[PDB]
Amino acid sequence: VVPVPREQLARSRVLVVGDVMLDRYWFGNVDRISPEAPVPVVHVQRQEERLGGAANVARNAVTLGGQAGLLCVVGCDEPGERIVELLGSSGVTPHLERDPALPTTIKLRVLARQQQLLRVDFEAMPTHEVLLAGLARFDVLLPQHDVVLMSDYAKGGLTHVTTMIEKARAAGKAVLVDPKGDDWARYRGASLITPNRAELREVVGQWKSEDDLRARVANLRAELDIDALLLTRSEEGMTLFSAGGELHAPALAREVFDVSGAGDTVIATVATMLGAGVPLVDAVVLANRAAGIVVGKLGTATVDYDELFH
Amino acid sequence: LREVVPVPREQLARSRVLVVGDVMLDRYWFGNVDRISPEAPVPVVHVQRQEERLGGAANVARNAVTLGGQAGLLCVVGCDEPGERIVELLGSSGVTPHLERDPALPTTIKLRVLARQQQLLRVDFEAMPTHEVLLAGLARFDVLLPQHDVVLMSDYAKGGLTHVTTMIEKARAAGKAVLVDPKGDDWARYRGASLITPNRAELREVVGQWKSEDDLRARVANLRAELDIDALLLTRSEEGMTLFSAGGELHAPALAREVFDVSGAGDTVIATVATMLGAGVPLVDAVVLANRAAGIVVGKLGTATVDYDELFH
């Protein structure tokens, strides 16, 4: 791959639309079991917070050197204000819709002895009224960017993903989709879809061989009119499927500490590279390198320009 | 045959119990578990409902009020959301609040995460109040003492009772009875207490494991003499409870026919004893009523209370 100029990345405008969330971590001690149940008791000593979901995707684009706009729906609560706060110092351009009746999506991880004990999730469906207002703001924000990134976590944020895809493709913009669910007809006309094994296995079933996997993907792209499919395979790296053929990149990870959010790094890198004129094939190689780097960091971290290149 | 006199309601109304100790917030998260965590071999809980109840020294005080007595609550509460909820909950509890504020203190809160009527984890937030705030509340204790009949020391080792010894003296010198819910292994701080109410584990920590019932009586009698404590009341879960005094022993067996949730049963116990004593009810009858109350409150969910209308009909 060819080293990419930072000033070229500077003109990469990525519009991230999807489910934003707050990654909160509780670190504590377990000295005893509960006197009420055969479960542990955690005395929390410390709390850490990072942007997650669509926000994690957006911030990954900024750290790489690109520009990122985040269109999402956030509730009027404590986790909500915390996201607004974190976004203000992230570099991402916030375009947040506010839903008073919506609990802001928050993923609460409870740890002890550097060992996770439980994850507590708060989330719900945004109101239909809010989703329309966000859709209206999308029409406004669409011509202001180059690449559209759909970050789906099935929290109801991308309820009108189909309409938005058509509008972006009708505007000549490239549409990238991080899938979730088994429908995937809503992802019709997407330029690039980026599932992991579990997400792909949900819509096409478990493949019996590479040729079988080759067929199921090719059959899927034709059915859904999707130009390319990018299957991230964890420790197996990733594989890009298109009419131009297949490219398999092995996992480059030197040290594997925390994997969580690596898929976000993958799709953010591809999007921000494509927005910098970088060819799809080269964007994928850099994405795999970025994923291999971000995997050696604790939590849902990012990867800077300086780390990816030198 | 009459075991204990049905206590008149206006007799309990004159009972003024001063609860001092560690107050907390019992928050509950009821959620669904549909998958394992993609990050760890642990469950993922999608919380659907939250509930909150007064706990710790606060739960004891509310038990005092539902029974028909009056309760005052001297405690330390932080300047945060869980703290404001306690303040907000005490507003409709019937308990007279005497709250000392500590801005550096996280309000003690016990967070229980449930799924499919099954507890998965309890998450605790707690710290030590500062010396300055403790001294301020210590002086406020002087103002409250002549306003109350009995003094209930609800210790949960959350730091709120660092000056128990000093307060016990002031209460005893004022001729007031001092009831103590113990914690730790020292118990020299509890010197001069009228009645002390440990569970089996709390007592097992200070005198070790008793090998027989006679061995238990020996250690308790030894403790009482060595600590200048008139009576010791040992709650023993499904065994019921045993009162130890100079006048002898009283064993009351567990009465609950339905055991749903036990959490905070000892709170109901010492609360009942306190309000009964303040209502002029003799100690022996108080324990009997306390055992009846505990048996009732055990059949209820969460940190519940038992009201007069249930205990006496």
Ligand SMILES: O=P(O)(O)OC[C@@H](O)[C@H]1O[C@@H](OP(=O)(O)O)[C@@H](O)[C@@H](O)[C@@H]1O
């Ligand atoms: O889909 P759910 O599990 O409900 O929510 C996503 C979480 O599992 C985490 O998954 C990651 O995304 P990826 O792991 O790269 O997909 C990150 O975005 C984290 O911020 C996020 O909290």
Ligand SMILES: O=P(O)(O)OC[C@@H](O)[C@H]1O[C@@H](O)[C@@H](O)[C@@H](O)[C@@H]1O
């Ligand atoms: O476990 P530690 O921190 O010592 O006490 C807190 C709990 O165990 C429970 O105690 C019970 O008696 C009740 O007071 C209840 O409200 C409280 O949550």
Ligand SMILES: [Cl-]
């Ligand atoms: Cl997998």
Ligand SMILES: [Cl-]
């Ligand atoms: Cl025990």
Ligand SMILES: [K+]
């Ligand atoms: K990471």
Ligand SMILES: [K+]
């Ligand atoms: K109960």
Ligand SMILES: [Mg+2]
């Ligand atoms: Mg993913």
Ligand SMILES: [Mg+2]
């Ligand atoms: Mg107790």
